Design a protein around this ligand. Structure first.
Ligand SMILES: N=C(N)N[C@@H]1CCCCNC(=O)[C@H](CCCCN)NC(=O)[C@H](CCCCN)NC(=O)Cc2cccc(c2)CNC(=O)CCCNC1=O
Lengths: 153, 38
């Protein structure tokens, strides 16, 4: 299976089938986040997807080819997080992103808390392009989660 | 060993639940890809 779309990343080295993260498949390349797979290779039915590019600082990795996702938050509009939680349905969540202010620029951020195995779920603009991956973020005073809209180059 | 299985298409949901504020945070991105609060 390499049909474009969103996929779950499962494993069996622990108790039963366990969703460790999410990813998107586009133009024959599978894009997820580095902490999901730690670069390890994946299987899809008969096949085997091997890593192609990765970067621990960006927390990104792509399989079977170069990173293909190049859409960005315009900033202004809201966006949807296509959350694929473990054991649960893919669900779309609309929100207006905030801002991670860094030394090298600003990044969009979504204030959406979901179980750990939701990491790598895509974030969409109103025209359907994937603008980033959910899962790398911070914990705030209130205790819940803020994730960056992490995109590749 | 990790395997992948498909969970949906990628499309915008016009009937989506809307939620989540829009905070701005001063953060640092360390060498290991971990965001921290400043
Ligand atoms: N925590 C909250 N409300 N929500 C998050 C939402 C995860 C969404 C998917 N994203 C990640 O799984 C990534 C992977 C690692 C990236 C590293 N490149 N994790 C993170 O971004 C942050 C970065 C911390 C930066 C410090 N250096 N880590 C955590 O939140 C783990 C944590 C921390 C304190 C206290 C706790 C859990 C205790 N809560 C819980 O047990 C609730 C169940 C688990 N819910 C969560 O984990």
């Amino acid at each position: 299976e390499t049909t474009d779309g969103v996929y779950r990343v499962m494993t069996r080295r622990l108790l039963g089938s366990t969703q460790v993260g999410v990813g998107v498949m586009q133009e024959g390349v599978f894009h997820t986040m580095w902490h999901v797979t730690k670069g390890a290779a994946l299987r899809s039915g008969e096949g085997r997807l091997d890593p192609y590019w990765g970067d621990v600082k960006q927390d990104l990795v792509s399989y079977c080819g170069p990173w293909k996702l190049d859409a960005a938050w315009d900033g202004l509009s809201e966006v949807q997080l296509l959350a694929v939680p473990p054991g649960e349905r893919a669900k779309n969540i609309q929100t207006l992103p905030g801002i991670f202010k860094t030394k090298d620029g600003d990044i969009g951020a979504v204030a959406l808390d979901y179980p750990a195995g939701t990491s790598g779920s895509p974030i969409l603009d109103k025209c359907g392009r994937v603008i980033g991956l959910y899962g790398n973020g911070v914990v705030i005073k209130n205790g819940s989660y803020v994730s960056a809209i992490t995109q590749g180059k | 060993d990790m395997y992948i299985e498909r969970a949906g298409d990628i499309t915008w949901e016009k009937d989506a639940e809307v939620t989540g504020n829009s905070p701005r945070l001063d953060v640092a991105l360390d060498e290991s890809g971990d965001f921290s609060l400043v």
